[PDB]
Amino acid sequence: VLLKEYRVILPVSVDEYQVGQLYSVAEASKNETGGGEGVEVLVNEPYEKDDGEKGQYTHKIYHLQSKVPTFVRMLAPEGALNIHEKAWNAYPYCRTVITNEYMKEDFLIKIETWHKPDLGTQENVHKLEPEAWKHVEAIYIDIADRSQVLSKDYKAEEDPAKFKSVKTGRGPLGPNWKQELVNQKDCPYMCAYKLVTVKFKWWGLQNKVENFIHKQEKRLFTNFHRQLFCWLDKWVDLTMDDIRRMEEETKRQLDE
Amino acid sequence: VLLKEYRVILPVSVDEYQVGQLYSVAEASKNETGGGEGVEVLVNEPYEKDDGEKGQYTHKIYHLQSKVPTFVRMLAPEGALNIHEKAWNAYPYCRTVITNEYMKEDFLIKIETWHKPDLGTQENVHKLEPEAWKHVEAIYIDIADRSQVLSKDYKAEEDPAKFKSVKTGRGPLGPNWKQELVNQKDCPYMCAYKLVTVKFKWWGLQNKVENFIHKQEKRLFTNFHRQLFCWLDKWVDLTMDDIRRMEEETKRQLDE
């Protein structure tokens, strides 16, 4: 198991972030062929834990069987194409747990995030016991830094260093943007503290695989938040009510 | 590398088989979500080898990127979602070679098949050099034998032991069907000699993985041919001209 916390400072409010994030998941995924087909919802209900954490809990299986060719669709070991996702939505706290039926208890990706109106200055925001916290590498992702982007991933249109919002005037984000965020007129700020736990038990590969998955999550968080900012004009005016209407709307396209 | 030859005796003619096979690939796959989307054709042209083998050669990449969720679509190692398929169509001889960009030269599934008007009595129909032929396990698949089917795979409607063709009168196939095939009035026969070469280099798993893939191919060949027979009334009257028209027709639905 490998734990790291990715701290993503952003020139948006905690309230705006909830909307932008949900919008961006959709628009970044407009791409997908069978988008949301083959998704079985096992559970979807309110919850409250003994510790007071409360929100909406879902449990879903993404069945990948029909989205791959038969020759590959066969071949897979039993359960390898059934990915489970458990999610606890308690915004501004969120948790997701991804597992796979074939891997059983040998594989897990857990992401627990606090969205806070600060500049990433909180140490142990997830309140880990002191010994566990000592094993967590803290990593800051800077959405304006070109050196944090893989050349193959780069797109001028998704580069915060080049984008200025028509609706808000935010951006472009220059090298000292974070240092001027706090006192800058009209710019809100927040930090997503994404604590990521990766387990991939195997044999002579565990360390290499857990580190590789972490690198892929870092990459994803970097690209995703660069996009989220550059799509500011598309979502800034949307409310959560709009987001809900939109999902039910796509859900109705379950006319299949 | 592991080589085995699967000999599939069938109550159809070599000529009928070409049509049934192509039809069944489609109908068994009607299922798939994005069916034939994301398929890049690199090459498609006539060929002739120095040894006289001649036909049509294609080289395709099945890009799986957009058919899986972003969170999985990310995660994959570079090239893991690009599957190459090379096919040589020289019916009644056929060859397919499947590889993967991430695995590079460490993974291969090659299937070479002769379709012959006989009862599987030819030894070394693929003309392997004697030493290589000695390492090939020959395996007969009997489409009427319930014991060769996995319980989870079983379907009464795809069981040759229960099906009788309305258009031809063939079937149902009882325990001694193969022994009466030759002298039975109005029943044609053939055998598909499918020589399957599997390479999966890895470390402490090569033997286990190559044997597992072979088991999956055997399973696929068993299910597929049970289906092909039970779908006899759907395709027996189709010609290859019909098949061609049908593919171009689905191809035109590249209106995307």
User: Is the distance from CB of A110 to CB of A95 less than 8 angstroms?
Assistant: yes
**Which one-letter DSSP state was computed for residue A136?**
P
- Describe chain A by its helix, strand, coil percentages, rounded to 5: 35, 30, 40
Instruction: Write down how long chain B is.
Output: 256
B109 closest CA partner among B238, B232, B234, B218: B218
Q: Which amino acid is at A200?
A: F
Tokens 């599987």, residue located: B120
Q: Show residues of chain B in contact with A200, CB under 8 Å.
A: none
- Describe chain B by its helix, strand, coil percentages, rounded to 5: 35, 30, 40
- For residue A117, report the phi and psi dihedrals to the nearest 5 degrees: -85, 65
Q: Show residues of chain B in contact with A70, CB under 8 Å.
A: 25, 28-29, 31-32
A194 closest CA partner among A255, A116, A250: A116
Name the β-bridge partners of A192: A8, A115
Cβ <8 Å between B73 and A32: yes
Cα A94 to chain centroid distance, Å, stands at 10
User: Is the distance from CB of B83 to CB of B61 less than 8 angstroms?
Assistant: yes
Task: Say which CATH superfamily domain B1-256 falls into.
Answer: START domain (3.30.530.20)
Dist. CA A16–CA A14, nearest whole Å: 6
> Which of A67, A98, A219 comes nearest B67 by C-beta?
A67
CB atoms within 10 A of CB B137: 10
B2 closest CA partner among B196, B191, B250, B165: B196
List strand residue ranges (DSSP E) for chain A, in order: 2-10, 39-48, 54-63, 82-90, 93-100, 107-116, 137-141, 190-200
Provide the token pair at A70: 């038969």
Method of determination used here? X-ray
> Which of A67, A204, A212 comes nearest B68 by C-beta?
A67
> Which of B62, B70, B75 comes nearest A213 by C-beta?
B75
Dist. CA A216–CA A109, nearest whole Å: 12
Name the β-bridge partners of B85: B60, B98
Cβ <8 Å between A62 and B69: yes
Radius of gyration of chain A (CA): 19
Q: Which chain B residue is nearest to residue A31, measuring alpha carbons?
A: B66
Q: Which residues have CB under 8 Å from B66's CB, separation 6+?
A: A31, A32, A33, B34, B37, B38, B73
* B interface test, pick of A25, A30, A33 with most B CB neighbours within 10 Å: A33
Cis peptide before A77 (omega within 30 of 0): no
Cβ <8 Å between B66 and A216: no
Provide the token pair at A94: 């969120």
Dist. CA B204–CA B95, nearest whole Å: 30
Q: Show residues of chain A in contact with B216, CB under 8 Å.
A: 74-75
Cβ <8 Å between A220 and B98: no
Cα A177 to chain centroid distance, Å, stands at 23
> DSSP string spanning B140-182?
EE-TT-GGGS-GGG--GGG-TTT---TTT------TTHHHHHT
> Which of B34, B71, B72 comes nearest A33 by C-beta?
B34
Provide the token pair at B119: 């009862």
Q: Show residues of chain B in contact with A219, CB under 8 Å.
A: 74
Cα A20 to chain centroid distance, Å, stands at 12
> DSSP string spanning A217-234?
HHHHHHHHHHHHHHTHHH
